[PDB]
């Protein structure tokens, strides 16, 4: 059936069709809702599959059914036959990557999907070559602060013994350090992958704000330790526009995220190695990053400086730090003229993205836990827009840890 | 299904174990293919639909009050089924009734609030035949659960659904809403998610004072009866007028809001029974008022006027000129409640009680069905331990649920 989707701000319906094409499961079923559970191959599996993908590349430029149709559907079944897998094309492995972006229901950046620059490091076969890959990539996305968005693809999963993964969450995290006396130095939810970097071998500065080594695994051997050059790694130093002593806090950021744990599916192939990378909405730095309690948990001392009164909750402290917080965030990385996105402009985007994807495509998957911005939400657009979420392939999918299932 | 399903929060680490959700009854509007979790909203019964409804809900309640299996079980359900058999309905007792007024909100996944559930008055006006009846009732619902401002959750029950033809409604959505008035000029004066009810009162007799804080009248349907407008004696409507405790320009907006939450256009639920007038109140978390109520775009709408006031730049949304505002305006709801003894509770103090609620309940009762996209507050919200915290959404019965607006559907006498 269709379905609608309204906007209670703005009383507009959309009506979604796209929702008929997916095949993946959501986890809910007609009486439970997991909308809120972070997380709920053959020959056989495959070639319908890789039919799929095949089938809706050439549909997506109009080639639906031609003889250059025809032939890869066959040279794709003669390729699954005699390997048990199959390779893309350059063009498909492009389109693949972008509609995997396009289809990720989380993302709130989404109106810039097309606009994703894709590097096929599929002949990649060490760890060495690894890391020149991603220094290539932090290189070209960093673009000296005028940021562009980029994936690098290593090579597909075969037998599940001979993994490419990127170890670190992202390629640029700072280091979190567990103390003698029980608190946490630099960024806690990193302790457990900063002490697999020293346990094997990386010599820890023990600052706030240590740019953490790559920690690179190519064809299922064990990873190895590399230092980025630290003149690829833009960071921003967070000041305030009127609280002068906001710079005393000593806190910066880096400018580039880059996620590097996820696993792109394309017509039934894994790539388990592909980091990609944007911008930042300020939101991910100022709230999460610096004010989850298990993160930096820096709003005590911001709203100390505030002077503002601690003793009860109801005087919304945490709130009125919260906000001068991500002032100050926005106001660094546009002073340094590194591109940053408000949750307001942003989530204004998102809503015009849908509005595009619906006209031209039928819908757009969107997941409302993850689209709302983690303050402010319901005066932001996206607050008051009701989504649909399903799951469309090509995707990103999340995968285990490396480190609970490599054999060293 | 499965027998048991985890949930995780990710700020504590804490797993709990949900088996409750085996006693959901309705559907959620999901499937394996499709969520619809932000969704808003995803002829009576006869005698074979009610029979198992109503078996469902007695064994409920003789299991609750540790007596199933027993001759007083076993009798009532004979009694009902008797009942049910003679007369096509049933009657609840007034111990069934309380139990399942109380549990309704219990089952309520939408609702931050429910620490306070067994702590419910429960009004019994199922005697009532009048509109004026109906007045006397929900007059004596709002002084109560006002208490001179230390307020009491209740809820008042008229009689239940019969053939669809008899049905006791408030017309108004909530007992103490202010009244909007669309303009020629396209401009709305008081409240613009009012205009639709305030233009049916209009017509139905009511003289407006055409002001920005005006209380709407009650509009009240008894025994399917044409709805009769009464105005509610305005010495039971408290209300606070809001005042910021630095900045002395905040009470120079002559803002104010009633201080009684009070929902009126739910339907309850119990064993079958269909309850399509129960008005229910609690006390307000101070976003309800602060963010939604005043800075809302199709609302009150004055995060500009006191940015303004504020001198804050409006030129950059990336000054975040709005969060700055909506903060403010939040401190003083909050500020000018407390000084009043209102009460109101703020959204860091309301998540961490229901935190603590649902974790009792996965406890005691093998699970908590809470809707996330409703229970984070609409500011901060993850600095709320709520954003953290993963949760199960299922429909157990008793429930509250929504009904089409009476003015759609009633048939004019
Ligand atoms: C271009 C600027 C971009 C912006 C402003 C942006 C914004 C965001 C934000 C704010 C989130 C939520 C993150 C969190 O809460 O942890 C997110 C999630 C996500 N983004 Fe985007 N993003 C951008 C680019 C991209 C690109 C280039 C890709 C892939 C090619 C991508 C794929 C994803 C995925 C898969 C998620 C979901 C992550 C998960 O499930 O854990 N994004 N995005
Ligand atoms: C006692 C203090 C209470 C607090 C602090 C509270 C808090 C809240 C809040 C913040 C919401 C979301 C409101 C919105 O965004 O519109 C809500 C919804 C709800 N509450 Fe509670 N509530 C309280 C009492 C009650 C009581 C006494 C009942 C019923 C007996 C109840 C039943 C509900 C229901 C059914 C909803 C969902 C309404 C809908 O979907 O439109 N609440 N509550
Ligand atoms: C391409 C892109 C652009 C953009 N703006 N944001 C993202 C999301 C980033 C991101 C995740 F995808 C994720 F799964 C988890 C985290 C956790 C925080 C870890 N952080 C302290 C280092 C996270 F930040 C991606
Ligand atoms: C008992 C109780 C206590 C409390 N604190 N809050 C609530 C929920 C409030 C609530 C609803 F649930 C609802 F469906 C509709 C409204 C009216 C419009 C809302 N707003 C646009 C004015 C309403 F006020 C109930
Ligand atoms: C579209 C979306 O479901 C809608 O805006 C919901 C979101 N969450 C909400 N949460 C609460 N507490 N109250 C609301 O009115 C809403 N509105
Ligand atoms: C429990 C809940 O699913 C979890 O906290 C989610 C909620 N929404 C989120 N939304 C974003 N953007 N990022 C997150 O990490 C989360 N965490
Ligand atoms: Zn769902």
């Given at each position: 059936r269709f379905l609608k989707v309204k906007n209670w701000e703005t009383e507009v319906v959309l009506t979604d069709?796209?929702?008929?094409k997916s095949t993946l499961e959501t986890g809910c079923t007609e009486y439970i809702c997991m909308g809120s559970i972070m997380h709920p191959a053959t020959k056989d599996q495959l070639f319908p599959l890789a039919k799929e993908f095949i089938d809706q590349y050439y549909s997506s430029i109009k080639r639906f059914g031609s003889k250059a149709h025809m032939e890869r559907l066959e040279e794709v079944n003669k390729e699954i036959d005699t390997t048990s897998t199959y390779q893309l094309k350059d063009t498909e492995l492009i389109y693949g990557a972008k509609h995997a972006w396009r289809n990720?229901?989380?993302?709130?950046?989404?109106?810039?999907?097309?606009?994703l620059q894709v590097f096929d490091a599929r002949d990649c076969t060490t760890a060495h070559g690894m890391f020149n890959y991603i220094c290539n990539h932090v290189k070209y996305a960093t673009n000296k602060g005028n940021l562009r968005s980029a994936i690098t693809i290593f090579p597909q999963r075969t037998d599940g013994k001979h993994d490419f993964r990127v170890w670190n969450s992202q390629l640029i995290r700072y280091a979190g350090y567990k103390q003698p006396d029980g608190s946490t130095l630099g960024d806690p939810a990193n302790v457990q992958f900063t002490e697999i970097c020293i346990q094997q071998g990386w010599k820890p500065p023990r600052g706030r704000f240590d740019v953490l080594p790559l920690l690179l695994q190519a064809n299922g051997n064990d990873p190895e330790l590399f230092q980025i050059p630290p003149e690829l790694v833009l960071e921003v130093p967070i000041r305030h526009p009127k609280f002068e002593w906001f710079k005393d806090l000593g806190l910066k950021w880096y400018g580039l995220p880059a996620v590097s744990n996820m696993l792109l599916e394309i017509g039934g192939l894994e790539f388990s190695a592909c980091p990609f990378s944007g911008w930042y909405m300020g939101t991910e730095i100022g709230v999460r990053d610096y004010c989850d309690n298990s993160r930096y948990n820096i709003l005590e001392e911001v709203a100390k400086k505030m002077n503002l009164d601690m003793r009860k909750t109801s005087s919304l402290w945490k709130d009125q730090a919260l906000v001068e917080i991500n002032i100050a965030v926005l106001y660094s990385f546009q002073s340094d003229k590194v591109t940053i996105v408000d949750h307001h402009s942003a989530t204004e985007s998102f809503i015009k993205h849908m509005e595009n994807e619906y006209r031209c495509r039928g819908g757009c998957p969107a997941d409302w836990v993850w689209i709302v911005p983690p303050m402010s939400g319901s005066i932001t657009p996206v607050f008051h827009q009701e989504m649909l979420n399903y799951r469309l392939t090509p995707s990103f999918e999340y995968q285990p840890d490396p480190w609970n299932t490599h054999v060293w």
């Open positions: 069709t796209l929702h008929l990720a229901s989380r993302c709130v950046g989404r109106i810039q999907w097309s606009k």
